[PDB]
Amino acid sequence: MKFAEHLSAHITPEWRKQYIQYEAFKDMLYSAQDQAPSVEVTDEDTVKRYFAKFEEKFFQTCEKELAKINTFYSEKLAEAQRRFATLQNELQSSLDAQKESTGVSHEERVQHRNIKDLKLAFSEFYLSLILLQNYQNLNFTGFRKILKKHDKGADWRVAHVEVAPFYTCKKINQLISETEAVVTNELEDGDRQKAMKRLRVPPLGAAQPAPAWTTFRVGLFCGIFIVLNITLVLAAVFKLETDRSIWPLIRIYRGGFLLIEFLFLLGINTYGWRQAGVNHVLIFELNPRSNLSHQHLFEIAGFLGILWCLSLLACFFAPISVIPTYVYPLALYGFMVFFLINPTKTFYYKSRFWLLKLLFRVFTAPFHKVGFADFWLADQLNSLSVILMDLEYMICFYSLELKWDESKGLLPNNSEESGICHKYTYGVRAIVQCIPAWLRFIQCLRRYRDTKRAFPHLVNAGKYSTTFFMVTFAALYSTHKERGHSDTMVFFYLWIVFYIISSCYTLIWDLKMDWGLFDKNAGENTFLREEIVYPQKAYYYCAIIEDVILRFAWTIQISITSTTLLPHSGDIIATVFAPLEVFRRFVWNFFRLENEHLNNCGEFRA
Amino acid sequence: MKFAEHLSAHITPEWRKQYIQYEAFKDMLYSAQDQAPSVEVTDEDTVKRYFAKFEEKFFQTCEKELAKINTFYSEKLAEAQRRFATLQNELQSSLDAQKESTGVSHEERVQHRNIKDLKLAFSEFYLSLILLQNYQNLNFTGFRKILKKHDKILETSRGADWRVAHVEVAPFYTCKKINQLISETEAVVTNELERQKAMKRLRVPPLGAAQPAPAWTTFRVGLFCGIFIVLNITLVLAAVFKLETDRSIWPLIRIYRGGFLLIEFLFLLGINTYGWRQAGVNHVLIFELNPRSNLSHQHLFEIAGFLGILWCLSLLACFFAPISVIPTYVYPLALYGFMVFFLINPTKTFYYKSRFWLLKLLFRVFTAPFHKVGFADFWLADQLNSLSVILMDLEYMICFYSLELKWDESKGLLPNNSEESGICHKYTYGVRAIVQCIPAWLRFIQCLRRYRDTKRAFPHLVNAGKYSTTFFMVTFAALYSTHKERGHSDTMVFFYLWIVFYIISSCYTLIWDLKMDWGLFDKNAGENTFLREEIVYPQKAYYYCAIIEDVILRFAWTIQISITSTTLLPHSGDIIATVFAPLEVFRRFVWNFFRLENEHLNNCGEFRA
Ligand SMILES: CCCCCCCCCCCCCCCCCC(=O)OC[C@H](COP(=O)(O)OCCN)OC(=O)CCCCCCCCCCCCCCCCC
Ligand SMILES: CCCCCCCCCCCCCCCCCC(=O)OC[C@H](COP(=O)(O)OCCN)OC(=O)CCCCCCCCCCCCCCCCC
Ligand SMILES: CCCCCCCCCCCCCCCCCC(=O)OC[C@H](COP(=O)(O)OCCN)OC(=O)CCCCCCCCCCCCCCCCC
Ligand SMILES: CCCCCCCCCCCCCCCCCC(=O)OC[C@H](COP(=O)(O)OCCN)OC(=O)CCCCCCCCCCCCCCCCC
Ligand SMILES: CCCCCCCCCCCCCCCCCC(=O)OC[C@H](COP(=O)(O)OCCN)OC(=O)CCCCCCCCCCCCCCCCC
Ligand SMILES: CCCCCCCCCCCCCCCCCC(=O)OC[C@H](COP(=O)(O)OCCN)OC(=O)CCCCCCCCCCCCCCCCC
Ligand SMILES: O=P(O)(O)O[C@H]1[C@H](OP(=O)(O)O)[C@@H](OP(=O)(O)O)[C@@H](OP(=O)(O)O)[C@H](OP(=O)(O)O)[C@H]1OP(=O)(O)O
Ligand SMILES: O=P(O)(O)O[C@H]1[C@H](OP(=O)(O)O)[C@@H](OP(=O)(O)O)[C@@H](OP(=O)(O)O)[C@H](OP(=O)(O)O)[C@H]1OP(=O)(O)O
Ligand SMILES: CC(C)CCC[C@@H](C)[C@H]1CC[C@H]2[C@@H]3CC=C4C[C@@H](O)CC[C@]4(C)[C@H]3CC[C@]12C
Ligand SMILES: CC(C)CCC[C@@H](C)[C@H]1CC[C@H]2[C@@H]3CC=C4C[C@@H](O)CC[C@]4(C)[C@H]3CC[C@]12C
Ligand SMILES: CC(C)CCC[C@@H](C)[C@H]1CC[C@H]2[C@@H]3CC=C4C[C@@H](O)CC[C@]4(C)[C@H]3CC[C@]12C
Ligand SMILES: CC(C)CCC[C@@H](C)[C@H]1CC[C@H]2[C@@H]3CC=C4C[C@@H](O)CC[C@]4(C)[C@H]3CC[C@]12C
Ligand SMILES: CC(C)CCC[C@@H](C)[C@H]1CC[C@H]2[C@@H]3CC=C4C[C@@H](O)CC[C@]4(C)[C@H]3CC[C@]12C
Ligand SMILES: CC(C)CCC[C@@H](C)[C@H]1CC[C@H]2[C@@H]3CC=C4C[C@@H](O)CC[C@]4(C)[C@H]3CC[C@]12C
Ligand SMILES: CC(C)CCC[C@@H](C)[C@H]1CC[C@H]2[C@@H]3CC=C4C[C@@H](O)CC[C@]4(C)[C@H]3CC[C@]12C
Ligand SMILES: CC(C)CCC[C@@H](C)[C@H]1CC[C@H]2[C@@H]3CC=C4C[C@@H](O)CC[C@]4(C)[C@H]3CC[C@]12C
Ligand SMILES: CCCCCCCCCCCCCCCC(=O)O
Ligand SMILES: CCCCCCCCCCCCCCCC(=O)O
């Protein structure tokens, strides 16, 4: 799209006559491409003459429009400071009239109407300032784009555009800060939240509502998913066979359910960030022009939910009666992976390719610098470890447990489980669960070796490394219970000895390094930090309590399982707790990204 | 909303200091509203003095706003004519540059770039002209609203004589020259710049009305559509598998066909209003709807999907028979009862304005002779002509729940046997006949009233014949059926008449559709073969396909009378009728698209005159 159509789409005609006429230069460039001769048509010396002309005429035209853009941004910055002076005098007059209502009622009612009217006045003035940054940054991007199209110029953009007064003058940016500092101290008399609520203008080309077609698709997918889920519940209640164990099916489909729930919660998270003002575009280093809003994620979440409901429903009662049952769980995940890769330039190709790059960089953790996106994804994998181990179990079941001859082999004939796949034997289960905590450990050590700062890159390393010992002790306990040694219970102690640590280690951390709460300076925000982006502190306290509970939720599992001795209690509690784990990650994302935006806690961009 | 907040929604802030600052006057009214003394507080003569001072002070304030807005529109209209002259100079200079490529390539490419750029120039010129029309009519309604609010508060009528004697003669309203300025813009663009494309770019959809519906309503439309689709599929599967194959499902089909027709009609009406809005046919003026707030296509898709969901659920509950203690014959009654309740809900929720407007329209239509027929009344009374099967199904359901259903049996909705012998589904007593002729009676009486009101024997009496043919059509059909029941010879002699009138009614109401409703086959055709001079919709293939579709569908019974008399299937007639009813609603949906266009263009109904 070459930053040509969407650029004109988000261009206001009011200043369009003096923006970088990118479309006009496109027309000139293609039209003069149409008259490119060959070696025989014009001699090589004349070819060099033609190319030298082309390049120098393009560069002098660029110089002319460069001078035009500098002239406009100089006059408009003089206008911006003149408007600063005028609006400052008007706000001083409003403050004097406030003193006429404070230090010395129809008059007071008129004065607060005037206060709100000037509030709207600096709102549209902030909009004009946003238009001026549009001028600046879109001019920069158009310069780069047209010049690199000509090149396909570099020392020209650097030696003209990067030093031109139309981008070297970052004061307009801090002028926006003035518009901030003028408001909060004078308009709101010290209220930051209402300021950022009113004056902060969402981008017209990015934060605009998504097309009604995408919202309709989201609604259609959500409705189909709801009805399919209801039909699935009824099918389980009635049409499901009660004489066969349904555990392999649950274990196979628990990963897909956890992934779809995660995508839906991530859509909610990105909506929350966008509304609260946390510019995750900069934090994630995403493309400012085109990015996935919350609806574009709800769409994929609903589509995959429909896909999972249909697959599970076909697994419940066979519709074809000639196709074996296991084909549905195989095909669902197979074409989910296909949709993930999808080499063709369709179905969110930009975001899918970006995610594929991120996954490749994360998985090969030690040999790559850790950005915020990489750390964030390798942390998200920590709470989605159930998906990885469930995929491992599905592979094991399809390899060494499933009977390919029997059509209804997915649901075992017997109601008892004795296969190797769901056991901790050989340590395979232990290893596939420690993968997410291995990537984070390696990434933390890489950050330490890249910044030579022992803190917090080494405390993070210990926090991530506790799970190694915890899982190892759990595996030893399971094996020694299988064999029945005297040391068995001893290993159990070590599990509980380390588990209560590996939760506390990830509980004093989530509340202090990630969420930044319990700050030394609190003031009005009890137990919180100085600045709270989100509206109500009740959300903050609910998040604290929820994380405190969910980091120890394993206590309930280890309490019921070791006491009640139900026919099948461990699997039930694990399957119940996995969605709670994903919910905990969803809650954590809000406050982690907010703190990263505010205090730059990760020291990523510095 | 008192035309205050939604008004503030559609107000460009750049002229906000120039319109009537309605909120300000709302504040001044509320001031002295809290400053109104009593008889004991101030004596009666002083009460009159205070009230008269209030009248005079709002009156000179209204005079000040009158003068300010008059001066602003005078300045803006002088600016508009200077802009018109200057843009005419620019556009004729573009004509000269065009002649450079025509009478006197990079130059031609640049010329068409300036052509598209100037097209944009008059795009925002049209936007500014529309803003001036806003300055006119929205401010007009602003004075209307503020003065009438003051009148109600102060129990006076001097505000009415003020608006009539100041605003109605004010230069800012009497000067309709800005509307003819838009007219000149359109004429110049059509003649010089470019009809279909000219009315496509210049015509700016209203910012407060045609703006896309909130995403929280498009989402609801999607949710309802998806639930409906899945429920529809589950219902088909339940019919294929879980439906009992020993009983006759005919009473259920007949009871539940009416709701399906109504929901399909509402969905097709949503499609129709989207088509009118996109094609540029303003249905707001023609239908006499409120320009500010009206139902867009999504607001109708929402109700259609919701009612489809409810119908599908009711049919499913009648199918699976859950709870196991509530009988099967409660679900259709509950569904139709709640539909009626939702139509007549008195609370100010769920499209209260639209529902009250529809209630008024239905009351005016059904008491046909006593009310002057507008376009809305004629249109609604015409819509029932293709929805008569719903009225027939409601009559059948009434008869079934009264005289044939067994209240003792739980599974009484589906009869024990597989044969039908009840009176309800027959033509006996003419109850199935008079119910069929109700929409025709309403239309016939409405058009006779139209004649008695305009004294123009045409086309108010030819249309009366069109709506009266079906009287003889139903009379002969019912009499033939009754005489065939007994077996008298004359029944055969009567049958001819039915078929005879079948080719005298469907023909008669065909030449009407293609000539006086749609207005095609006009004497002046030109390039538009078989069509009228000006066509709004893009492709003429749509028009020809519509002609073929209407020709086929107005003659539907030809197939039915061809099949039920040949195969002699035990239940061919009911199957064919149930198949044809949705086709009948589709034929009405197609007819609307072109009837409204012709009414907009040629004022064929002669309604607004
Ligand atoms: C046993 C049966 C159980 C069945 C459960 C199956 C799952 C049910 C799923 C429920 C619906 C999920 C999606 C609902 C929200 C859809 C959002 C959407 O697409 O609309 C956009 C919405 C409004 O648009 P606006 O904010 O004006 O524009 C923003 C510009 N980008 O803008 C927004 O995005 C903001 C508002 C929506 C986001 C906040 C609320 C999200 C949903 C909260 C949970 C709802 C219930 C979830 C499932 C039940 C479990 C609790
Ligand atoms: C495989 C291991 C199993 C464990 C789980 C691992 C995968 C979890 C799901 C993916 C991670 C969550 C989504 C990550 C993106 C979040 C970032 C965000 O808020 O913005 C969305 C992002 C923006 O991208 P954008 O700015 O449009 O790109 C412009 C490029 N110039 O755009 C995005 O949305 C980026 C992500 C791609 C698009 C949405 C996700 C598609 C996933 C398809 C299904 C995956 C199935 C995996 C197989 C499971 C089998 C068990
Ligand atoms: C991705 C994988 C590939 C796709 C897989 C196929 C699609 C999903 C699975 C559809 C399954 C449909 C049902 C198949 C029935 C097979 C036979 C059977 O066991 O019947 C179920 C039961 C039997 O009742 P019985 O009285 O024994 O019938 C006697 C027959 N004369 O009968 C009953 O209980 C009644 C039947 C109820 C069926 C409800 C099914 C609802 C969902 C269907 C699909 C909806 C999709 C909608 C969304 C699509 C996207 C727009
Ligand atoms: C045996 C199983 C059988 C299965 C059958 C089940 C029933 C099928 C039900 C299908 C329902 C589809 C209707 C839902 C469409 C709603 C679309 C919508 O609301 O989108 C908004 C759309 C674009 O909006 P925009 O122009 O951006 O802005 C408008 C300014 N306010 O604005 C619009 O509304 C305009 C564009 C959409 C409307 C025109 C096309 C809609 C209908 C297409 C056909 C649908 C299928 C019909 C059923 C099949 C039989 C033929
Ligand atoms: C009883 C006899 C049965 C035979 C059928 C008779 C009823 C058929 C359905 C109603 C007729 C179709 C609706 C006609 C609308 C035509 C105008 C149009 O396109 O605009 C929609 C109109 C605009 O209204 P608006 O401008 O918002 O309000 C004006 C004041 N501000 O707003 C509208 O949409 C107006 C209509 C009201 C809202 C939608 C319809 C709700 C009705 C609920 C279901 C009706 C159930 C009837 C009983 C059936 C039992 C068998
Ligand atoms: C407004 C009206 C009043 C309210 C209406 C109530 C809701 C609509 C009716 C729901 C009916 C649910 C099914 C009830 C079944 C009762 C038992 C029965 O006859 O079952 C039939 C079939 C075979 O059962 P069988 O195998 O014999 O059972 C053995 C017992 N262990 O067993 C089966 O049913 C097979 C499983 C398929 C069930 C498909 C049901 C799909 C629809 C459910 C509702 C969806 C609503 C979603 C939208 C809500 C809005 C968001
Ligand atoms: O839409 P995209 O896939 O992101 O590609 C477009 C555009 O592709 P097209 O040539 O097909 O229009 C190209 O614009 P130019 O720089 O060549 O003028 C270029 O991508 P390619 O050259 O590889 O095709 C560019 O860069 P990128 O793909 O890295 O984003 C990008 O345009 P935008 O950066 O403005 O989106
Ligand atoms: O929302 P609506 O039902 O259309 O009513 C509003 C508004 O009602 P509210 O007082 O509740 O805001 C009133 O505006 P005022 O004339 O009092 O300023 C008045 O209706 P009521 O007095 O009966 O409540 C008026 O008339 P109507 O309801 O007939 O339309 C109408 O305002 P609009 O005419 O601008 O729509
Ligand atoms: C993550 C996604 C791709 C799900 C993984 C599915 C694929 C990769 C896995 C799951 C089950 C697997 C099969 C399980 C068992 C056997 C039998 C063995 O003798 C040859 C390999 C073969 C045939 C495997 C091939 C790969 C396989 C199809
Ligand atoms: C560098 C340090 C801190 C981390 C190294 C992590 C690796 C080497 C650890 C983490 C989890 C461990 C496994 C946990 C459980 C089992 C099962 C047991 O019956 C044999 C050992 C075995 C298979 C362990 C092997 C080593 C292991 C894979
Ligand atoms: C008390 C414990 C057990 C449960 C409560 C935790 C849950 C329900 C709370 C804690 C954090 C909360 C979120 C915090 C902030 C926001 C942003 C706001 O714009 C919308 C609500 C939203 C998205 C909240 C939704 C509810 C939420 C997820
Ligand atoms: C209206 C929307 C929510 C869909 C309706 C779904 C719920 C309310 C329906 C669908 C399936 C129904 C159940 C189906 C079967 C039985 C068995 C018997 O004991 C009667 C009640 C009972 C237990 C029903 C109660 C209501 C029920 C649970
Ligand atoms: C158009 C909408 C309202 C649907 C019509 C439903 C209502 C009006 C109809 C449907 C069936 C009807 C019932 C059918 C049969 C009888 C038995 C008779 O001895 C008294 C009246 C009574 C009890 C009727 C009352 C009205 C009734 C409940
Ligand atoms: C004014 C004229 C032109 C139109 C009047 C239409 C009315 C009066 C007509 C139209 C349909 C007619 C009915 C059609 C069929 C039957 C059944 C028959 O067994 C007795 C007469 C009866 C019940 C008719 C009575 C009169 C009727 C109701
Ligand atoms: C083939 C014959 C027998 C029957 C088919 C008729 C149907 C499919 C045709 C006839 C009239 C047509 C409509 C006429 C005009 C419009 C308005 C336009 O903006 C979108 C398409 C739309 C909405 C058409 C859709 C298709 C349509 C409904
Ligand atoms: C005007 C143009 C389209 C001609 C229309 C012809 C139609 C209306 C005519 C011509 C032939 C006719 C059919 C000829 C023969 C019979 C057999 C008789 O036992 C019942 C009526 C029936 C089935 C007629 C029904 C009406 C009919 C189909
Ligand atoms: C499964 C049946 C679906 C019926 C309705 C489908 C509605 C969505 C069709 C999408 C077509 C592509 C249009 C994309 C336009 C956009 O995203 O702006
Ligand atoms: C049947 C369950 C539905 C669950 C999801 C419901 C989504 C819509 C809920 C609307 C809440 C109120 C907001 C209405 C806003 C509006 O009027 O546009």
How far is Cα A315 from Cα A250, in angstroms, rounded to an integer?
Answer: 11
Quick one: B355 and B301 in the same domain? yes
Query: Could you tell me which residues come within 8 angstroms of residue B423 by beta carbon, excluding any fewer than 6 positions away?
Result: B399, B403, B404, B429
Which residues does chain A have within 8 Å of residue B106's beta carbon, measured at their own beta carbons? 31
SS3 B83: helix
How far is Cα B273 from Cα B285, in angstroms, rounded to an integer?
Answer: 13
How far is Cα A302 from Cα B223, in angstroms, rounded to an integer?
Answer: 11
Domains of chain A: total:
3
CA of A355 to the centre of ligand 1 (A): 24
A189 assigned to some structural domain: yes
Query: Could you tell me which residues come within 8 angstroms of residue B56 by beta carbon, excluding any fewer than 6 positions away?
Result: none
Quick one: B175 and B128 in the same domain? yes
Contact B532, B599 (CB under 8 A): no
Residue A551 assigned ligand-binding role: yes
Structure tokens at A528: 């919180």
A455 assigned to some structural domain: no
How far is Cα A109 from Cα B581, in angstroms, rounded to an integer?
Answer: 64
Beta strands in A425-492 (DSSP E): none
The closest of B466, B479, B484, B367 to B432, measured between CA atoms, is B479
**Read out DSSP for A111-142?**
HHHHHHHHHHHHHHHHHHHHHHHHHHHHHHHH
Which residues does chain A have within 8 Å of residue B229's beta carbon, measured at their own beta carbons? 220, 224
Contact B119, B193 (CB under 8 A): yes
The closest of B215, B221, B233 to B305, measured between CA atoms, is B221
How far is Cα B394 from Cα B389, in angstroms, rounded to an integer?
Answer: 9
How far is Cα B448 from Cα B459, in angstroms, rounded to an integer?
Answer: 11
B534 CA to chain A: closest CA distance, Å?
A: 32
Structure tokens at B298: 């999504």
Quick one: B81 and B143 in the same domain? yes
Structure tokens at B329: 């014959």
Structure tokens at A369: 């610098």
The closest of A294, A134, A132 to A207, measured between CA atoms, is A294
- The finding on whether B296 has its CB within 6 A of some atom of ligand 4 is yes
Interface list for A 229-288 with B (CB within 8 A): 231
Contact B381, B368 (CB under 8 A): yes
Burial of B389 (0-12, 13-18, 19+ CB in 10 A): buried
A348 assigned to some structural domain: yes
Classify A244 in phi/psi space as left (phi over 0), alpha (psi -120 to 50) or beta.
Answer: beta
Residue type for position B251: P
Contact B13, B130 (CB under 8 A): no
Structure tokens at A522: 């609190």
Quick one: A146 and A216 in the same domain? no
Structure tokens at A536: 């109500």
Which residues does chain B have within 8 Å of residue A113's beta carbon, measured at their own beta carbons? 27
Computed on alpha carbons and rounded to an integer, the radius of gyration of chain A in Å comes to: 30
The closest of B291, B37, B33, B21 to B149, measured between CA atoms, is B33
- Give the closest of B120, B222, B234 to A223, CB-based: B222
The closest of A579, A577, A587 to A546, measured between CA atoms, is A587
Residue A594 CA, chain-centre distance (Å), reads 12
How far is Cα B86 from Cα B113, in angstroms, rounded to an integer?
Answer: 19
CA of B500 to the centre of ligand 16 (A): 9
Contact A340, A352 (CB under 8 A): yes
Length of chain B equals 609
How far is Cα A37 from Cα B346, in angstroms, rounded to an integer?
Answer: 79
How far is Cα A35 from Cα A28, in angstroms, rounded to an integer?
Answer: 11
Q: Is B116 an 8 Å CB contact of chain A?
A: no
How far is Cα B182 from Cα B128, in angstroms, rounded to an integer?
Answer: 10
The closest of A426, A429, A419 to A390, measured between CA atoms, is A429
B20 assigned to some structural domain: yes
Residue A426 assigned ligand-binding role: no
B341 CB neighbour count, 10 Å cutoff: 10
A606 CB neighbour count, 10 Å cutoff: 6
PDB experimental method? cryo-EM
The closest of B226, B223, B133 to B175, measured between CA atoms, is B133
Comparing alpha-carbon positions, the chain A residue that sits nearest to B230 is A224
Ligand nearest to the CA of B196: 15
- The finding on whether A591 has its CB within 6 A of some atom of ligand 11 is no
Residue type for position A453: R
B73 assigned to some structural domain: yes
Contact A146, A22 (CB under 8 A): yes
Q: Cα(first)–Cα(last) distance of chain B, in Å?
A: 32
Which secondary-structure segment (H or E) carries B313? helix B297-320
CA of A398 to the centre of ligand 9 (A): 7
Which secondary-structure segment (H or E) carries B412? none
B309 CA to chain A: closest CA distance, Å?
A: 11
Structure tokens at B292: 């500010």
Query: Could you tell me which residues come within 8 angstroms of residue A463 by beta carbon, excluding any fewer than 6 positions away?
Result: A505, A506, A509
How far is Cα A309 from Cα A307, in angstroms, rounded to an integer?
Answer: 6
How far is Cα B578 from Cα B314, in angstroms, rounded to an integer?
Answer: 19
Domain boundary among B172, B201, B230: B201
Question: What is the three-state SS of B275-301?
Answer: HHHHHCCCHHHHCCCCCCCCCCHHHHH
H-type helices in A484-518, by residue range?
A: 488-504
How far is Cα A477 from Cα A491, in angstroms, rounded to an integer?
Answer: 5
Burial of B26 (0-12, 13-18, 19+ CB in 10 A): middle
Contact B307, B336 (CB under 8 A): no
Q: Using alpha carbons only, what angle is made at residue A312 by residues A309 and A318, rounded to the nearest 5 degrees?
A: 125
How far is Cα A591 from Cα A516, in angstroms, rounded to an integer?
Answer: 9
CA of B236 to the centre of ligand 4 (A): 21
Comparing alpha-carbon positions, the chain A residue that sits nearest to B14 is A124
Which residues does chain B have within 8 Å of residue A225's beta carbon, measured at their own beta carbons? 226
A456 assigned to some structural domain: no
Contact A534, A276 (CB under 8 A): yes
Residue B222 CA, chain-centre distance (Å), reads 22
Quick one: A239 and A120 in the same domain? no
Burial of B592 (0-12, 13-18, 19+ CB in 10 A): buried
Residue A272 DSSP symbol: H
Which secondary-structure segment (H or E) carries A318? none
Quick one: B51 and B163 in the same domain? yes
Ligand nearest to the CA of B404: 13
- Give the closest of B13, B113, B223 to A219, CB-based: B223
Comparing alpha-carbon positions, the chain B residue that sits nearest to A12 is B124
Which secondary-structure segment (H or E) carries A60? helix A44-102
Quick one: A585 and A512 in the same domain? yes
SS3 A206: coil
Contacts 24+ apart (CB under 8 A), A124-129: A124/B13, A125/A83, A125/A87, A125/A179, A126/A176, A126/A179, A126/A199, A126/A200, A126/A201, A127/A201, A128/A80, A128/A83, A129/A80, A129/A172, A129/A175, A129/A176, A129/A179
Domain boundary among A391, A412, A433: A412
Q: Is B31 an 8 Å CB contact of chain A?
A: yes
Residue A463 assigned ligand-binding role: yes
CA distances (Å), A580 to each of A391, A543, A572, A593, in order?
Answer: 19, 13, 13, 20
Residue type for position B176: K
CA distances (Å), B369 to each of B3, B436, B468, in order?
Answer: 35, 19, 16
Quick one: B12 and B138 in the same domain? yes
Structure tokens at A260: 């779809």
Query: Could you tell me which residues come within 8 angstroms of residue B168 by beta carbon, excluding any fewer than 6 positions away?
Result: B174
How far is Cα B25 from Cα B8, in angstroms, rounded to an integer?
Answer: 14
Q: What residue has token string 């206590």?
A: A555
B384 assigned to some structural domain: yes
Contact A527, A495 (CB under 8 A): no
How far is Cα B344 from Cα B346, in angstroms, rounded to an integer?
Answer: 6
Contact A587, A543 (CB under 8 A): yes
Q: What residue has token string 């029932």?
A: B384
Residue B392 CA, chain-centre distance (Å), reads 24
Which residues does chain B have within 8 Å of residue A13's beta carbon, measured at their own beta carbons? 120, 124
Structure tokens at A395: 């592979």
B599 assigned to some structural domain: no
Expressed in Å, this structure's resolution amounts to 3.7
Which secondary-structure segment (H or E) carries A227? helix A212-238
Classify A516 in phi/psi space as left (phi over 0), alpha (psi -120 to 50) or beta.
Answer: left
Length of chain A equals 606
Contact B513, B594 (CB under 8 A): no
Quick one: B56 and B90 in the same domain? yes
Q: Which of A28, A110, A227 to mutate to test the interface with B (most CBs of B within 10 A)?
A: A227
Residue A210 CA, chain-centre distance (Å), reads 18
How far is Cα A593 from Cα B149, in angstroms, rounded to an integer?
Answer: 51
Quick one: B162 and B276 in the same domain? no
Quick one: B233 and B194 in the same domain? no
CA of A359 to the centre of ligand 2 (A): 9
How far is Cα A377 from Cα A436, in angstroms, rounded to an integer?
Answer: 10
The closest of A200, A201, A170 to A77, measured between CA atoms, is A170
Contact A517, A527 (CB under 8 A): yes
Containing structural domain, residue A395: 210-412
Question: Cβ of B226 and A220 within 8 Å?
Answer: yes
Question: Cβ of B226 and A227 within 8 Å?
Answer: yes
Contact B181, B129 (CB under 8 A): yes
How far is Cα B4 from Cα B146, in angstroms, rounded to an integer?
Answer: 10
A59 CA to chain B: closest CA distance, Å?
A: 20
Residue B534 DSSP symbol: -
Contact B395, B431 (CB under 8 A): yes
The closest of B344, B328, B341 to B256, measured between CA atoms, is B328
Contact B477, B520 (CB under 8 A): no
Residue A585 assigned ligand-binding role: yes
Q: Cα(first)–Cα(last) distance of chain A, in Å?
A: 33
Structure tokens at B22: 């309605």
- Give the closest of A106, A218, A219 to B31, CB-based: A106
**Read out DSSP for A232-254?**
HHHHHHHTS-SSS--HHHHHHHH
Contact A478, A489 (CB under 8 A): no
Domain boundary among B405, B425, B445: B425
How far is Cα B56 from Cα B49, in angstroms, rounded to an integer?
Answer: 10
SS3 A13: helix
Quick one: B216 and B185 in the same domain? no
How far is Cα B599 from Cα A412, in angstroms, rounded to an integer?
Answer: 70
Residue type for position B449: R
Asked whether the CA dihedral B45, B46, B49, B55 is positive or negative, the reply is negative
